[PDB]
Paper text:
To reveal the structure of the C-terminal region of LACV-L and the overall architecture of the complete polymerase, we determined the structure of full length LACV-L (LACV-L FL) by X-ray crystallography and high-resolution cryo-EM. Transcription is initiated by a “cap-snatching” mechanism, whereby host 5′ capped RNAs are bound by the L cap-binding domain (CBD), cleaved by the L endonuclease domain several nucleotides downstream, and then used to prime synthesis of mRNA2,5,6. The previously unobserved C-terminal region (1752–2263) protrudes away from the core and forms an elongated arc-shaped structure that includes the mid domain (residues 1752–1841 and 1978–2025), the CBD (residues 1842–1977), and the ZBD (residues 2026–2263). We also capture snapshots of LACV polymerase in both pre-initiation and elongation-mimicking states, thereby revealing, amongst other conformational changes, the movement of the priming loop that unblocks the active site cavity and permits accommodation of a 10-base-pair template-product duplex, characteristic of elongation.
LACV-L FL was subsequently characterized by cryo-EM, resulting in a 3.0 Å resolution structure. The resulting “stable dataset” was further 3D classified resulting in the separation of two defined states: (i) the expected pre-initiation state and (ii) an elongation-mimicking state in which the complementary 3′ and 5′ vRNA formed a double-stranded RNA that could be accommodated within the active site cavity. Based on the RNA promoter sequences with which the polymerase was incubated, we expected to obtain only the pre-initiation state. In the pre-initiation structure, this loop protrudes towards the active site but is disordered probably due to the absence of RNA and nucleotides. In the cryo-EM map, the polymerase is monomeric and some density present at low threshold suggests that the α-helix 91 may fold back into the same hydrophobic pocket of the ZBD, although the binding might be rather labile. The C-terminal extremity of LACV-L is an α-helical domain with a long protruding β-hairpin. Its two equivalently sized sub-domains surround a metal ion that is coordinated by the residues C2064, H2169, D2178, and H2182, suggesting that it is a zinc ion.
Numbering used by the authors: -3 to 423, 438 to 547, 555 to 871, 892 to 1031, 1039 to 1409, 1423 to 1529, 1545 to 1615, 1622 to 1636, ...
The structure:
Amino acid sequence: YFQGMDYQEYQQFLARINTARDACVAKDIDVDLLMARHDYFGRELCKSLNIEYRNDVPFIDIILDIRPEVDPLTIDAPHITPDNYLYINNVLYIIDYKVSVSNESSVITYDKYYELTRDISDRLSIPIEIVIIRIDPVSRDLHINSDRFKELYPTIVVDINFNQFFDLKQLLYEKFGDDEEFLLKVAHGDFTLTAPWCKTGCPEFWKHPIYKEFKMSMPVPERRLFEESVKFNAYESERWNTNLVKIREYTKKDYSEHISKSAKNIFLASGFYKQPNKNEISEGWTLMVERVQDQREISKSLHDQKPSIHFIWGAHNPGNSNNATFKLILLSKSLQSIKGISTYTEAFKSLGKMMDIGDKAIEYEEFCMSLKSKARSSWKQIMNKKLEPKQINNALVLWEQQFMINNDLIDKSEKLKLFKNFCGIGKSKPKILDFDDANMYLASLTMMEQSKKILSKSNGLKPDNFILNEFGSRIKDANKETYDNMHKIFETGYWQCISDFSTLMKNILSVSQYNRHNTFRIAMCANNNVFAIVFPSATVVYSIIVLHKEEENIFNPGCLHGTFKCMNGYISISRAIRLDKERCQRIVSSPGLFLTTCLLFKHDNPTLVMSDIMNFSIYTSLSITKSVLSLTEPARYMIMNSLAISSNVKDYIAEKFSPYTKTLFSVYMTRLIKNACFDAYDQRQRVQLRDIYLSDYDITQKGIKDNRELTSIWFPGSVTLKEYLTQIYLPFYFNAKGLHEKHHVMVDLAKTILEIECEQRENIKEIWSTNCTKQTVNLKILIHSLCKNLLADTSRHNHLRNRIENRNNFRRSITTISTFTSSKSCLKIGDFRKEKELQSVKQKKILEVQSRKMNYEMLRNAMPNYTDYISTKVFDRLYELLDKKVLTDKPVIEQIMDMMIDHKKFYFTFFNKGQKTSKDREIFVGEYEAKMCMYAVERIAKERCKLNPDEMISEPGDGKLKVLEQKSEQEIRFLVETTRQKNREIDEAIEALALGKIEKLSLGKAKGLKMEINADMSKWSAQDVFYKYFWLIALDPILYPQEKERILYFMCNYMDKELILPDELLFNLLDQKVAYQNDIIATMTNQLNSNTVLIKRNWLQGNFNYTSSYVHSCAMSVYKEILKEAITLLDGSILVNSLVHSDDNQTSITIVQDKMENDKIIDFAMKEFERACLTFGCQANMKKTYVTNCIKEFVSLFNLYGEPFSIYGRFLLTSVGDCAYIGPYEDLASRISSAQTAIKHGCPPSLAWVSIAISHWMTSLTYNMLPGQSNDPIDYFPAENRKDIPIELNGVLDAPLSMISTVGLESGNLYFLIKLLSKYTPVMQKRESVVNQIAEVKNWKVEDLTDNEIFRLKILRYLVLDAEMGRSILTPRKFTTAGSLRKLYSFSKYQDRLSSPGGMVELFTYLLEKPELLVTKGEDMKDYMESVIFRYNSKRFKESLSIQNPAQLFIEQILFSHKPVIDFSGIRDKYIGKVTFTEAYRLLMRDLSSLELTNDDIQVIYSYIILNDPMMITIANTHILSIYGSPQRRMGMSCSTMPEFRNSPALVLRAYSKNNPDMARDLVHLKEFVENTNLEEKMKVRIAMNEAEKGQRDIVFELKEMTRFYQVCYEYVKSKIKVFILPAKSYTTTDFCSLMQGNLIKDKEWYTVHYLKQILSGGHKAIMQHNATSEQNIAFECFKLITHFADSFIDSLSRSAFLQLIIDEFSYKDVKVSKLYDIIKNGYNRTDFIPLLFRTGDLRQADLDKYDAMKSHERVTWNDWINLTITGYNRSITIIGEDNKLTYAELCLTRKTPENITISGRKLLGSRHGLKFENMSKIQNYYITYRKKDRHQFVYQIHSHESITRRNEEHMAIRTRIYNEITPVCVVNVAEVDGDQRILIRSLDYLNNDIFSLSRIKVGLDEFATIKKAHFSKMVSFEGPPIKTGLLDLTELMKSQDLLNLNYDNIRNSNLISFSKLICCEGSDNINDGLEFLSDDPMNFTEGEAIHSTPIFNIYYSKRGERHMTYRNAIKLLI
RNA sequence: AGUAGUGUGC
RNA sequence: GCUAC
RNA sequence: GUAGUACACUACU
Ligand SMILES: [Mg+2]
Ligand SMILES: [Zn+2]
């Protein structure tokens, strides 16, 4: 599937770039490239419009075609020309094609054409409606201004890529990037700046102390250059770049000497780079053990271990009942009957007696049911009615399973002992286990063996559950082996153990919510032997109790307290486990993690044992402590740094790896990591490159081979490199969030900040250096590299300031920016005494009351220098600053420039992210003015970084994966081209001779080397020299001097910023009672005198990422120049690519040379990478930096050898819990979005379905909707199973996986409607498009539908149509209180506006008189303030402002499941107290039968969710029209950006509100699509009805009606870069949908998909012309296939008989080939099928003519020895002269314009010519010239005399490029004539007497006429009578799939089963006589040649073979 | 007891 | 925290 | 100031 070009022209463009040297020649190449892009869009657009593609016809020809009756001279015409014309229903349309991204050239051509044709038109009286059609190439959408043109073509389906023009322009600007005659000519205009952002600067910057320090640090001339550069105004100078050129030429000497010295270091390097090996890992391990022993308390006792899993387990007893009361009685009689005397035994007997109800069970059940009936009858909680414990028998029963701790049944000593020593109620180095010990590893191993012994037995249960019963069909359809592995998981005791711990922990969390201080509760699970006592206590204290018959038959992961002997067997109690509800939340969701981990480690690997995988994964998925976190995150660095070529894994293991082994699984996993480090050294050389298939267009096969030679890490077996990287990188995503205590991480973060600040105060003094001193910057090199990079990026794009002002909204108001109006944290530096002491006395008073039922003034006294701070939200702080008139509604950049002076102190505080690493990171909360100023600086740096092709800003949404792939593929192509070019003579000599000479001849070949530096930077923001950014701001030409001066004054005040210590950190450190010894906190704060520390050199994390990105890419450009000069010293080639993302780096180096060894080059390149980072004040973290040959690794994205790769398991594991617990639909939608992101990153289909199954399971677990539970909707609706219920009513998702990954939870409704169309549309239009099936809904009989279908249509008609803001229906309504909502200023204004005398009605009428800011916000200050007051009435917003843990949200959605939480009033009023779920079900099914379903209801169902979205139309057309092709393996994967299927909401809703379209055509067409629906009047009928039944006019009802109206209009209107990983590169949109359906149907292989009709429709308006274009495309595919099939596979003597036999009785894609051939013969592009029309005999002069009219070739004559005739299309020259002197020269053209004369002179004087024009002549008017070019090169083109003088002047600029005149020769007489026809219709039949080929005929001497090619996979869609030819059926050859290959080897080595399809003899006598009806042309045989590189690989390419390699010979060898 | 910790907490 | 007196 | 502070699982085991 090639894009849009061919061999003939794409190779010519690639050649014409790769030889030129002149800037005029390069500009001509660029203008020809833009012209070819224009011509390509013109051809495809005219093909789409089904009009004739004209060739820039003049107005004379247009009028003489539309009035072919008048005199051709009288009525006038201008001398300009259109692109094409169109005259229909007596209106002439004039058409122009633009491929611009700007709209300005379109309107310039509009008012350039309009007035000249209005001069014409009111003479002949014809409406000339001129049309411009502007395609945007980077985002393909059409801009047709002529709205009188769109009613003929309301949708246009042009689906072409402009990428192969972009890469051509890319390599063109790559080649002449350093040129300067090129750039100023290819400039879009002159360099312009906009208005200043401020009038005045800051004179106080020049006397600021930080500037004084910066200035005194530099030498004197750099002080002069800095001062001279700040005061430089680019707008006031004659050249904008005179400053940058001046400073560059100043520092050039030191720059050149530095690059030359560092490049001369290529010879000083002996190649002993830091390899990893066994000694380095062993010595680093020994240093690690010494460091960890001297930092930890290393214990050798075994019983110092901590619980590896906080749970013990034993299997169930099938002899007992699984009844709740019976299990309660059994737990009581088992706890009381304990034999023996241990410590806590009498306490356990007393607790067994406290839950003893004896024989009184019915009383218990009745009492508890009465209480639950009273609790469930209210939405709110039951208030002011106390719970009395009822003495049932011997238990004081408070609720169901909540018993009172009776002091009469326990004695006080045992009670104290149990609550104190066992439960911990009222109780110096960190102790870890000795991982390095022998007996401790033996004990850990024995634990793993015992757990594998007990848990791998069978359950005895049935293996089915929700996952299996609802999704196992789809899972088994994608992969049977995943279904079998999942069945094997479900059979074992692993799954039952983790399911019991999930169910039991959910019950523990449900039960401990309302547990009291004197009650204990019992939690039960489905296992009738596993129990839990939840102790009185927010955290959870529980203890597992296991009943078991035989002793030692318990799963004990280090958690057991003791086993005891009871009645009927043994009883085991675990220790008390105290957990917070977050880790319990992760335990609840752990079966999803276990199943995902097991099936993902197991996936497609028959060498792994499943019980080993389960034994590892039950401990990693149930790990909720830091002990495994200390192993999973360092394991990446240890195993990858010991796998790599070069790293410092000794320094990482010695200095950074610190295992923290408190459990025994930590010890076992530590030994796994150690043995994998050793083994990873042992297996670097088992990584093999896959063979690379090329075509000179694309790389088809690529990557690493899939050999299982690698040693598996976490469990025994063998493994692939992809599976090895999975086992390395996946366990970091096993870690939990929120495991950190704030208590310790605030101290750790503050210590890190203050230690770096202290060391910088007392040790770091030098700012600039020259010897790579740490935390210094080389000054000359910084300045020179910045001047070079600013000159390149600024002279490339002149309007950069305008781009920065538009894209970042600098000219608009601050209320229109999402960054300044968010809900993030801000900071207020004021005097907040009163509010803090109010909340302090309230929490103390509260504390005292809770201790009755059984400080900030301290800090303000004990700290004098305390600044006072508070943390509001961002939107509230903007509201406060607008209400206090600090900020206004001016343009935001003027306010930022004012704030850069007005705000002089910056305060930053911090808090913990709570991430899943070992040491937590921190985010720095700034105050609001810091956010404004850093917004200005960072948006300037951001939009300068996006100019760079290798700075990863523009595509943050995983386009970095696509960029990595592009870089890797061009480095593969570079390595192949360079090694085959340099070593061509030596390989010719090797093949010549070829034994002994060949190897020593090979010894002197050019060796290829490919290197990838996967670098991290050490302390990126902390140890950074901030003074280099002063040179970045000062050298920037786009800034006025006042703007530079204010931004640098902000920089200087920012180096005086202060870090506020948070108040809880100080409350920690003041209440310590012992002085911490070497206290860095008390030193830096002067013994806690203050809470602020002046942080200076550390700019904080996340504040200057783009500025640092820009200087980091400058450092990498210096590195690139060093490497290029060093490899030119060796006279080799080099390609250096470097990707930069702030603190990450990926530099890839490809070198082909022959002088020295590769190890010395690796040593040089790594030493110079370190030095290039150090010269700009960076330092590459050499402990975390590694070097490979194959693997790239950018920000968690891989690239193996050109094949992209990602750990998709992180998105599978995130999908287990990621939800805010809003409702079932919203939770399910969030989880499925995570599964979609997994699919984009290369997840196989079966694991994606396992993820969707787990998502449905976890969402139904949250709301008690599992089958059989109380909210199971299955018996409350008319449905067979859960697939037949809509997702809004809590059913499961039934859809194809490609449909889920494209839309997701709109796939259920869409697939239901596609099933309805497949069931109910009439039988003739079954295989028709979706628009042709939706229109025939009118012929449905709705009476005899299925009642399930009527129910599902009525839900969608009445509830999904008129909904609010995929949408839900049954959301539970949480009763939350007033939240905090008192720190806010805006809520306070809402409160004293609510209780105001008539103020709220003023707000409501202000909203209603300007209603657009109900679904947007406002431009103005005032309306932003009014709308942010109005958003408090939304209870969703009020509760979203509250801080909230999601674990409590989970527990509350569990517990409020039987309570009436569904507001059925809002459900009922959409189609006409609170309600439970089941009553919502009953009432909805009752009220829905009250409504009626008509045909017009179904019409507006299909018009709302299919026909009004082009995405839904194309997805439905993919599912209807699919044809699945042939299976094949996924050998080369590739990245494809998801296309936009639609070919500001503030602007269009303000436009529709105030009726002003303000960009001019989008708004009026979109308000047409708004006004056309006309369903508005029912709203105001409801308004009048409410005014009737309430008398007075209502306003709140009018606001609710208007909000519903604008939201259901916003859904019609709806006002991202998504990269996928597909088995091939898609280019079009149909290619993407084909690859998406083929990828997502099996794990083992992908299918090719092609479609019947055009799947890209535009809507229900253009039907007939859509069918016309679809049939035209089918005709095109049919005859491309037939012509190439017949001249590729059939005998040359018999093809036209074959062709006529195909044309008569055959049909391609259900359309007869006769009809398709009539379509081609009658269309306007017959020239595309000239050999077809010739072989059938339907070819006319016009066709052929129109062929050389629109397409061409240069023709020379006359090599006699004196007159030359160079003819082209309407272009011919005649040149008359001797060897010395030329007499005259006559050009001949079609039009005489000075552009076309030079174009024709360029093209006609570049073919094979005689001589070099070697004389001159004085000259006065067009002439032929030549410039000289070094080593016998010249350029031959016609200039004007004036242009000869001008270009001689411009190349006589005082420069270094050596001057070459264009010395001119002979006069050119420019005439004009009609060009003759070069291809007569009768001039072919002699020329093709021996050309027997249906797809290629001769038209010239050496010009052919071809038909394009089409893939043979589409040959299965033919249909017809078997063509018996002797013994073969060629119809079966068309339907074959193994024999249609074009390779000779794949048919020669093919099978007899594949050939037995063809045989149909009926009486022959020889195979040789029957095989005569086949091809005799030589086929293509793939030949692979090894590439001389250190990652050694083979390339394979097609060849023409020899004369014997035919098709008949392959069939005969097969036979 | 559990969790966190070469910062005294829960 | 919340609810009632 | 006093009193109150309300609920899920219930399973093939
Ligand atoms: Mg990295
Ligand atoms: Zn036969």
